[PDB]
Structure formats: structure tokens, C-alpha cells
Amino acid sequence: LRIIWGTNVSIQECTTNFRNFLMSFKYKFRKILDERDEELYYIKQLNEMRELGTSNLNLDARNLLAYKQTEDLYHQLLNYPQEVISIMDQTIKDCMVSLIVDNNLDYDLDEIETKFYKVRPYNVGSCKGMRELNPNDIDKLINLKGLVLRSTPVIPDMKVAFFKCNVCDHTMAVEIDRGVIQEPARCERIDCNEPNSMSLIHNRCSFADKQVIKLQETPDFVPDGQTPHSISLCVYDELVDSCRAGDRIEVTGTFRSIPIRANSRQRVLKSLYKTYVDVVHVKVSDKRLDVDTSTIEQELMQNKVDHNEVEEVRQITDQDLAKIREVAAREDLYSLLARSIAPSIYELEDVKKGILLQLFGGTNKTFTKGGRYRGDINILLCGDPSTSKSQILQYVHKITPRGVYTSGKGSSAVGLTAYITRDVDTKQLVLESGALVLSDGGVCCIDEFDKMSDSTRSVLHEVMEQQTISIAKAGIITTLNARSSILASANPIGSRYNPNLPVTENIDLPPPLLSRFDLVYLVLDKVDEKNDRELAKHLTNLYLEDKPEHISQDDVLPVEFLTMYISYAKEHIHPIITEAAKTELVRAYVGMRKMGDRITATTRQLESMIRLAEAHAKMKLKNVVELEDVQEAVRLIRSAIKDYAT
Amino acid sequence: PGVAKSQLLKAICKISPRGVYTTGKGSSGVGLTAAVMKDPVTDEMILEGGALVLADNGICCIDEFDKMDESDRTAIHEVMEQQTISISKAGINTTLNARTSILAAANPLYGRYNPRLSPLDNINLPAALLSRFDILFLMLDIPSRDDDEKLAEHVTYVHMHNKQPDLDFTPVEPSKMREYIAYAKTKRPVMSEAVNDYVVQAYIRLRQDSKREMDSKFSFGQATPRTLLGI
Numbered sequence: 078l079r080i081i082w083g084t085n086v087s088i089q090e091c092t093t094n095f096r097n098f099l100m101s102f103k104y105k106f107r108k109i110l111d112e113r114d115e116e117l118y119y120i121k122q123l124n125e126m127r128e129l130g131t132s133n134l135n136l137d138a139r140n141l142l143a144y145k146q147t148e149d150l151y152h153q154l155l156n157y158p159q160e161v162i163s164i165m166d167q168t169i170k171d172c173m174v175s176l177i178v179d180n181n182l183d184y185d186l187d188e189i190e191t192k193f194y195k196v197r198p199y200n201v202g203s204c205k206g207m208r209e210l211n212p213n214d215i216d217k218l219i220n221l222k223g224l225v226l227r228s229t230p231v232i233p234d235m236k237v238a239f240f241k242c243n244v245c246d247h248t249m250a251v252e253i254d255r256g257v258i259q260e261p262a263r264c265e266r267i268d269c270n271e272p273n274s275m276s277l278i279h280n281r282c283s284f285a286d287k288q289v290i291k292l293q294e295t296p297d298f299v300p301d302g303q304t305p306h307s308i309s310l311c312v313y314d315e316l317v318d319s320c321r322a323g324d325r326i327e328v329t330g331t332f333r334s335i336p337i338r339a340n341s342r343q344r345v346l347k348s349l350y351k352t353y354v355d356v357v358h359v360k361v362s363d364k365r366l367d368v369d370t371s372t373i374e375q376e377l378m379q380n381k382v383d384h385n386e387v388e389e390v391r392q393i394t395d396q397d398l399a400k401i402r403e404v405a406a407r408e409d410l411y412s413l414l415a416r417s418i419a420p421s422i423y424e425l426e427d428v429k430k431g432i433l434l435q436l437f438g439g440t441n442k443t444f445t446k447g448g449r450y451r452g453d454i455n456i457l458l459c460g461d462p463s464t465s466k467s468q469i470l471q472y473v474h475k476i477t478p479r480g481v482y483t484s485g486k487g488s489s490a491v492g493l494t495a496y497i498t499r500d501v502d503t504k505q506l507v508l509e510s511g512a513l514v515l516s517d518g519g520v521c522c523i524d525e526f527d528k529m530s531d532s533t534r535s536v537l538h539e540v541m542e543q544q545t546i547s548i549a550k551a552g553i554i555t556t557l558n559a560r561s562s563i564l565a566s567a568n569p570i571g572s573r574y575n576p577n578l579p580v581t582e583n584i585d586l587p588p589p590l591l592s593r594f595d596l597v598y599l600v601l602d603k604v605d606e607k608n609d610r611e612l613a614k615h616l617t618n619l620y621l622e623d624k625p626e627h628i629s630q631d632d633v634l635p636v637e638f639l640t641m642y643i644s645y646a647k648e649h650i651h652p653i654i655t656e657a658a659k660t661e662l663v664r665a666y667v668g669m670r671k672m673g674d675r676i677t678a679t680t681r682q683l684e685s686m687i688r689l690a691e692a693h694a695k696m697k698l699k700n701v702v703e704l705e706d707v708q709e710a711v712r713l714i715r716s717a718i719k720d721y722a723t
Numbered sequence: 724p725g726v727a728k729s730q731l732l733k734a735i736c737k738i739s740p741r742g743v744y745t746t747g748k749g750s751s752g753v754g755l756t757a758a759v760m761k762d763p764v765t766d767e768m769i770l771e772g773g774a775l776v777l778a779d780n781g782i783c784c785i786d787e788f789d790k791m792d793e794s795d796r797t798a799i800h801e802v803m804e805q806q807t808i809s810i811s812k813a814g815i816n817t818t819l820n821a822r823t824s825i826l827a828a829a830n831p832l833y834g835r836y837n838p839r840l841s842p843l844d845n846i847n848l849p850a851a852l853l854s855r856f857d858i859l860f861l862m863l864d865i866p867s868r869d870d871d872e873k874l875a876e877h878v879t880y881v882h883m884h885n886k887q888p889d890l891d892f893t894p895v896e897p898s899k900m901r902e903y904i905a906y907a908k909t910k911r912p913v914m915s916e917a918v919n920d921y922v923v924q925a926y927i928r929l930r931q932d933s934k935r936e937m938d939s940k941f942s943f944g945q946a947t948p949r950t951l952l953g954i
């Protein structure tokens with residue numbers, strides 16, 4: 078039997094056995110999933126590849142596990158990427174040919190048979206992270222996680238060369254395929270002699286696209302005592318401009334290792350090789366955390382249509398959409414959704430409710446010239462410590478798609494933008510994005526808001542007000558936007574809050590800046606006895622029977638309905654706040670202005686009430702607001718106002 | 724000062740493996756967080772760890788907690804929430820991990836122990852940091868007639884010799900002790916339902932009597948639920 082020299086594969090068994098895979102697939106992945114649509118996938122997805130004209134079929138790996146046979150081809154694939162991927166390409170093309178001979182008059186048969194089809198696999202295991210990898214395991218497939226720092230520009234690559242002479246003149250050309258390009262010394266015209274000069278015109282030849290993206294990961298189950306780490310990867314043609322600066326990406330690719338020169342002068346290729354990744358498939362969306370917006374995305378909605386790519390937005394299916402319109406008919410949604418956010422922390426349903434309303438933030442209205450009104454709302458919450466302020470911030474840090482978590486006294490005025498530095502691998506001056514440009518669209522978090530400087534906290538007078546940032550130093554003189562929803566916290570002098578003391582006095586802020594924040598909570602403690610029984614019964618309810626059961630009685634909690642509920646509530650709704658409520662709204666604002674002769678009330682309360690109000694109208698799927706429900710949009714400030722009497 | 728507290732810190736920061744003993748000042752702010760430096764022959768730009776990144780899953784002894792710079796205080800308060808030290812300096816945006824345990828040793832206000840003076844008057848630390856410690860101690864120093872002879876025979880019995888205990892006890896050698904404690908950490912016990920009742924009712928006791936004083940007297944208010952999770 079035939080074999081390849083580096084491996085143990087054969088072209089016949091892989092080809093015919095994989096052809097035998099693509100004709101029968103009946104949810105054996107559910108037979109592992111234990112069952113808790115009977116037509117197979119790849120006829121349907123091959124038709125979706127067929128009529129729409131898009132290339133780039135993609136399959137999983139667990140699907141290759143579940144079917145028996147071809148339990149073998151998986152272990153062939155995970156070891157030997159390049160050859161096996163080439164084989165699956167060839168049999169996909171012949172499967173398209175074997176489909177088209179059913180009706181015989183299909184799509185001008187030559188070119189759609191001529192066009193390159195390719196395979197992108199993913200989900201190929203995750204056992205041990207980047208650190209453990211021995212040099213035994215050079216060429217395999219690897220999954221990673223973590224974010225993305227910067228993005229190099231575009232650099233071409235020769236795929237075709239092009240030659241001329243001065244005699245007299247003939248114009249042969251040559252390809253690459255292996256590592257080097259040979260050029261002839263003689264001849265053309267005459268061929269034979271004379272051995273004329275052979276020039277290279279480097280404005281006529283073909284090229285390619287090669288982009289380098291630098292990455293930093295978070296490999297869970299750490300090899301203690303590990304510190305974070307940085308890898309550099311080298312994406313190719315189609316996947317150029319498929320990664321911004323800030324996303325959370327899960328990557329597949331082939332680990333490689335190529336030596337580097339010494340000092341650009343000799344041929345002394347230094348030993349002790351350098352490693353990188355050589356990506357294949359990029360996985361941006363996810364099913365557990367939140368989904369990105371649409372008013373931000375619209376430039377790359379305007380792009381990416383000429384050239385077929387990946388989805389970037391969670392695909393809303395059709396069957397559960399009926400369940401969305403069913404759960405929307407529930408009356409108790411306003412306490413059910415706010416009850417189902419953080420099922421391990423149990424108080425402060427006005428605060429849970431405001432954190433729910435930060436996820437539904439405002440209506441994005443753009444004017445003709447100027448304007449540019451976002452849906453930003455901004456929340457402080459303070460009070461006594463030992464009140465689980467941190468649990469909320471870690472949970473919101475998990476849910477948010479593009480969240481960045483700084484702290485107090487670990488900041489600087491440099492430390493939030495323009496880290497203009499010296500990159501080592503290319504040895505030039507490359508500019509980095511700081512801590513708010515990565516926060517662009519989403520939720521930031523700041524702890525210990527008391528203990529900033531004067532220079533820091535003078536950043537936020539621009540971000541909170543103008544919704545811009547204006548860098549002006551020696552690199553770049555150009556303003557750049559950072560829309561963000563800032564959440565923060567502070568601990569008083571006490572640390573216990575004492576009564577008969579001014580509320581503005583007990584937190585060391587200038588009360589205009591305290592007056593600039595939208596929704597200010599003041600969570601204090603009660604000396605009474607009746608709640609604490611239910612408190613300890615919740616804790617020992619959690620510790621018992623060593624299994625996550627935490628809240629099942631007497632409550633229904635959606636696990637991941639709410640993320641697609643929020644995203645579907647974020648695209649397909651535009652709420653408008655027309656005439657009939659302006660009487661009550663202006664009436665209550667002038668009623669708020671009545672107090673005069675501690676904290677006061679400015680126009681930020683009015684801007685606050687319209688944006689929080691229409692944020693409540695974004696919930697429960699209503700394109701207009703009503704005169705009713707504005708009252709509790711006032712009461713969200715009035716609950717803190719009853720918490721301001723003491 | 725003479726309750727011999729530094730001996731325990733050198734001791735338990737010698738029994739436990741991966742145990743780092745840092746004095747007051749001492750380390751800078753950048754000494755016990757990580758820093759970035761260029762790496763010789765293997766390349767490049769690794770985050771060189773500090774004191775806290777060195778000793779994780781261990782014990783970090785600290786002397787003279789009052790004399791710390793205030794940036795170090797916020798670093799310690801970030802260690803009191805789990806896993807987290809966050810840096811936004813000139814070349815770092817990372818969130819490194821630390822699973823450490825902190826033992827501290829703070830001195831009172833000068834000179835010592837005035838019962839005229841209130842608690843937290845003789846303490847230079849806020850009660851939030853007192854609430855982050857689930858267990859707080861105090862070692863008094865009052866002259867008393869009876870213990871002095873036992874103490875003098877104890878100490879002079881070791882300058883006279885090199886071993887203290889007698890009648891009837893031998894000290895366990897520390898290697899076998901580390902084998903015992905190293906064996907002990909593979910158990911994961913499971914609670915039950917009668918201890919639920921007893922823990923709940925005891926928490927009702929402590930919560931109940933702790934908040935009927937409400938004063939800056941020798942009482943310490945207000946028995947936060949961190950004591951419940953700590954107990």
C-alpha cells in the first residue's frame with residue numbers, strides 16, 4: 078500500500094472514507110449529548126453554499142468523533158493538518174461535481190466548477206494551554222483565548238515573478254511554489270546567446286496579503302505560579318481586517334517555528350528558534366456572553382459584503398423567536414429579568430434593576446449636522462463595605478462584550494491612552510491604544526473612585542461630558558471617540574455611614590462631579606433581625622450538597638435566553654417618546670427644581686430621565702413610550718431620595 | 724512590643740513552602756507588584772514578578788503594616804478581593820493572578836494600650852480593613868506575678884541548654900509535620916443540616932447582641948457577615 082514519507086496516511090482510504098462521511102449524518106453528536114431535522118447537514122449547507130454563491134464551508138470536529146466509522150480520520154487530522162486539509166478540499170470539489178449531474182443545466186458549469194472551495198475546521202480540543210507545549214508537538218492544531226492588542230499594516234507577498242531584458246524584448250515569468258525564486262541568466266531573443274542582462278520589473282507581478290496581529294491570552298487552569306504572556310500570529314488573505322483592537326477571540330491554527338537572522342548583515346541564522354501561530358479559523362461571536370451592537374458596526378456592515386466572511390453577529394434562529402414573543406407576554410418581566418441577573422447576591426433590586434437598565438442604554442439618534450446623541454447612562458454605587466460590591470463588578474465584567482477593568486492608584490494620565498512605545502520585533506515606533514479606547518462601546522469599571530489624583534479624574538470631565546478624547550502630543554494630533562458606560566464605586570471615610578451628617582460630606586468628591594453622575598446609590602445596613610435568617614439560609618443553601626443548584630425554588634431562571642433577548646432588544650427596536658408624556662415629564666422636572674433655599678438637581682437629571690425612560694421603553698418591545706411607566710422611571714431616583722433622609 | 728511576634732513570622736514563614744517575608748520599607752510599590760524588563764538571551768519582554776507574584780498559594784508575612792505607602796495599601800486591598808492585581812502603567816494592561824494568604828503585624832499608636840483611649844484611637848487603620856480580616860487578635864502586656872517565674876525558668880532553661888520542652892512531650896520534627904499537613908489537604912469535607920441550624924442560630928446571637936451597643940467603646944461593631952462566611 079502507498080504511504081507518505083513523514084506520515085501514515087493514504088489518499089484512497091481518506092478520500093473514499095470521507096466521501097462516505099459526507100453522505101450520512103443523523104445527529105450522533107446528540108447521541109453523545111444524550112438527547113434531552115432528521116435530514117443531514119451537508120446537503121442543506123451545501124445548498125446554502127450553492128445558491129448564495131459564498132465559498133468557505135466549515136465543520137466541527139466532534140462531528141467527526143461521533144460518527145463511526147472515521148473515528149480514525151480525526152486523529153489523522155489533529156496531527157497532520159496540511160495534507161489532510163488538501164485532501165478534503167479535493168473531495169469537496171468532486172462532491173460538487175457529483176451533485177451537478179442531477180439536473181445538467183446549472184450555473185454555467187465551467188466557472189463554478191473552476192472556483193476554489195476550501196475547508197475551515199474548528200473546535201479541535203482544548204486540553205493544555207500555551208505554556209505546557211513541548212517541542213515534540215510542533216505541527217498540530219491549537220486553541221487559544223484572550224484579547225488582541227494592536228494590528229500591523231498590510232504587507233504583500235510575491236506569488237508570481239516577472240522578467241524582461243533589454244534585448245529585444247521577451248518577457249518570460251516564473252512562480253514560487255517552494256521557498257525560493259530562481260531566475261535565468263540567459264536567454265530570450267535570441268535564446269541562444271548573447272547572455273544579456275536580465276532585469277526584474279517589480280510593478281507588474283502578482284501579490285498577496287499578509288497581516289500580523291499581536292495577541293495576549295488568559296489560559297485558565299494556570300500552571301502556578303504563572304504570569305501573563307504574549308504570542309504573535311500572522312493571519313492571511315481573506316481574514317485580513319477580521320480583527321479589531323479589543324475583541325475576545327478563540328483561534329485555531331498551526332504552531333510553527335522558523336529561525337531568524339542575526340543583525341541583517343550576514344547569513345548567520347541564529348539557533349534557538351522563534352515560535353508563532355499560523356491561523357485558520359476565527360471564532361468572533363459567542364453564545365454565553367453578550368452580543369455586539371449595530372450602530373458601532375455600520376462601517377464594517379458597509380464593508381464585508383463584497384467579500385464573503387464570518388458572521389460577527391449571533392444568528393437568531395426562528396423557533397425560539399416564538400418563545401421570545403411568548404416570554405414578552407409575561408406580566409412580571411420587570412422583576413423576573415431583574416431577579417434573574419445575579420442569582421447569588423440578594424438585596425438591592427433597584428440596583429440590579431439599574432444594572433439591567435445599563436444594558437438597554439438609551440436611543441441612538443443622529444442629527445443632520447452635529448448632535449450625535451448616544452444612550453450612555455452612568456452609575457455610581459457606594460456605601461459601607463462588606464456589601465458585595467466586588468461580586469457585581471466581576472459578574473458585569475464577565476457579561477460585557479468589551480469590558481476593561483482598571484483600579485484606583487494604578488492609573489496615570491498616560492495610562493488611559495497613547496502608549497507610544499518601541500516594538501521589539503520590527504524595531505520602530507508603534508502606537509498602542511490605552512485603557513479607554515479598548516473600552517469603546519460597552520462597560521468600564523473603576524474601583525476606589527475616592528483615591529484618584531487631580532490629573533487622573535480630569536480625564537473623565539471629557540469622557541462624561543463631550544463624549545470625545547482629544548490626544549494632542551507628538552505622535553498624533555487627532556481627536557478620537559470612546560463611547561463607554563462608566564460604572565464605579567467608592568468607600569467612605571467612616572467606613573460606616575453615620576446619620577445626622579451630610580451625604581455630600583461623607584464621600585470626598587466635589588459635588589458638581591458627584592452631581593454629574595446619573596444614578597447614585599447609597600446602600601446602607603439595617604440593624605433589624607428578620608432579614609438575616611433568610612440571609613444565612615441562602616448561604617448555607619449554597620454551601621450544601623456540593624452542586625450548583627442555587628436558586629430553583631420558587632423561581633424560574635433563564636440561563637441564556639436573556640443574552641439573545643437583550644441583543645434582539647438592542648437591534649430591532651427604535652423607541653420614540655412623543656407628545657403625551659411631556660406634560661408629566663416637564664411637570665416633574667419643575668417639581669424637582671422647587672427644592673432650594675447637600676445635593677441639587679440640574680439638567681443632567683432631565684437628560685437622565687428621558688434616556689432612562691426610553692431605556693425602560695426599549696424593554697417589553699414597544700416602539701413608542703407611554704404616559705404610564707414614566708412614574709417608576711422617576712421612582713428609580715426617588716428610591717435613593719428616600720435613602721437620603723436618615 | 725515584647726510579646727515575641729516576629730518569631731512566629733519567621734517561624735511560619737519557614738514551615739510553609741513558598742513563603743515570602745517582606746519588611747515594611749522595604750519593598751517599593753513596584754517591588755511587590757510585577758515590572759517589565761528586557762530579557763537576555765531568550766527573547767523577549769517578560770514580566771518579571773515581584774514579591775506577591777512569587778508567593779502565590781502560600782503565605783506572605785508582612786512586618787510593620789502601618790508604615791506602608793498608601794499605594795501598597797490599595798494593592799493589599801486588591802488582594803483581599805480574590806485573584807486580582809490590575810495595572811495600567813506605561814507598558815502594561817494586564818490582570819495577573821495571586822491566590823495568596825496574608826498575615827500582618829501592626830503596632831498600636833504610641834505608646835501602648837491606654838484603656839482611657841478607645842479602640843481604633845490606638846489603631847492607625849480603618850475599620851473596613853478590620854472587616855476584611857475575619858480574625859483579629861491583640862496581645863496585651865500587663866505585669867503579673869505568677870507567670871514571671873515560669874517565664875524566667877523557661878528562658879534561662881534555654882540559655883542553659885538548647886532544647887526547651889520536658890515532662891512529657893517531644894517536639895515533632897518539621898519535615899514529618901509538612902508530610903502530615905501536606906497529606907491533610909486532599910479531603911474536601913461536606914456539611915449537613917444540623918450544623919445549618921446551629922450556625923444560623925449562632926449568627927442570630929452575634930448579630931443580635933452586636934448591634935445593641937452602637938458605641939465607640941471597647942465593643943467592636945457591627946459583626947459583618949464576613950464573620951459568618953469566615954466562621
Ligand SMILES: Nc1ncnc2c1ncn2[C@@H]1O[C@H](COP(=O)(O)OP(=O)(O)O)[C@@H](O)[C@H]1O
Nearest residue numbers: 724725726727728729730731828830874877878
Ligand atoms: N514568651 C516568650 N518566650 C520567649 N521569648 C520571648 C517571649 N516574649 C518575649 N520574648 C522576647 O521578646 C522579643 C520580641 O522581639 P521580636 O519578636 O523580635 O519583635 P517584636 O519586639 O516586634 O515582637 C524576642 O526577641 C524574644 O526573645
